[PDB]
């Protein structure tokens, strides 16, 4: 299995991406957390916003697939995707993530 990590600038858009992702049997579960402040330099000036962070679960075979779809769907031209693979997992959730897809 693996983990997909992503962010969106508004909650509703994150909900939309998660909804479209779920509709196509690409995933088993979706994880969202709001109220994220983004600080960065822009033309040399500090910024700060409020966005949401989104975490994902899937099995190792479907990771490139969800990555491809997220690239295809995400609003911003340069979209956040981070990949993580858990070291160990309980057999019950390996079965359950196989279950819900």
């Amino acid at each position: 299995m693996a983990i997909i990590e992503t962010t969106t600038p508004t909650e509703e858009e994150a909900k939309a991406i998660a909804k479209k992702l779920l509709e196509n049997r690409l995933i088993a579960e979706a994880i969202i957390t709001p109220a994220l402040t983004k600080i960065y330099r822009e033309n040399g000036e500090i910024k700060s916003e409020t966005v949401t962070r989104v975490t994902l679960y899937t099995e190792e075979e479907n990771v490139p697939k969800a990555v491809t779809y997220i690239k295809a769907i995400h609003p911003d031209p340069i979209p956040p995707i981070i990949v993580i693979t858990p070291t160990d997992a309980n057999p019950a959730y390996k079965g359950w993530v196989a279950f819900e897809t």
């Binding site: 057999p91 019950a92 390996k94 079965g95 359950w96 993530v97």
Partner: protein, 188 residues
């Protein structure tokens, strides 16, 4: 014990090591030992039941003394709530009542360790309106295991996918049959 008692399973490469583990565990908590016997191909199988916390402390002591990571331990498992259907086959092999419906489908599952077998079977029975039929445990087969289930084709495929997902690399062979013969019903 709870209506779905917690079950602790450990398989070891030594018999004396299983003896110490049972002794230390029974020091740790007042759990009930179900079986401690040498099992093919010479392994030691320990079975115990009790409250979830007593079971937890039993495993505390067991893995503390087991020398984890030294290679003497091969596999281990636990389940909080054993599905009620499992319990009749748990104590002794109780051949289920004769098949009533002729158009059922059937599968057979094969694994390498008893823990994967019991865990996968428990999850599968948690899934569907499927009925267990038989199961064997590590005796005269060099520590392997197998079990069978019946049901309807769609939930059969659902269960097969769940089963591969649970088992992973420990899976040896999984299969499906749609219409078994009368000459095998009860004669499995």
């Amino acid at each position: 014990d709870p209506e779905r008692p917690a079950l602790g399973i450990l398989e070891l490469s030594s018999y004396a090591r299983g003896v110490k583990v049972a002794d230390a565990a029974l020091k740790a908590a007042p759990v009930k030992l179900l079986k401690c016997e040498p099992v093919e191909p010479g392994r030691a199988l320990i079975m115990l039941l009790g409250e979830p916390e007593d079971v937890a402390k039993a495993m505390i002591a067991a893995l503390d003394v087991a020398g984890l990571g030294s290679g003497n331990l091969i596999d281990y498992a636990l389940i909080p709530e054993i599905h009620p259907q499992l319990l009749p086959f748990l104590k002794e092999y109780k051949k289920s009542e004769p098949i009533k419906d002729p158009n059922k489908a059937i599968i057979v599952a094969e694994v390498s360790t008893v823990a994967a077998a019991i865990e996968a079977a428990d999850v599968a029975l948690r899934l569907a309106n499927v009925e267990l039929t038989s199961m064997r445990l590590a005796e005269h087969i060099g520590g392997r295991a197998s079990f069978t289930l019946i049901g309807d084709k769609e939930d059969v495929e659902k269960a097969a996918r769940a089963i591969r997902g649970v088992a992973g690399e420990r899976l040896l062979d999984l299969e499906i049959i749609e219409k078994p013969v009368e000459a095998l019903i009860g004669n499995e």
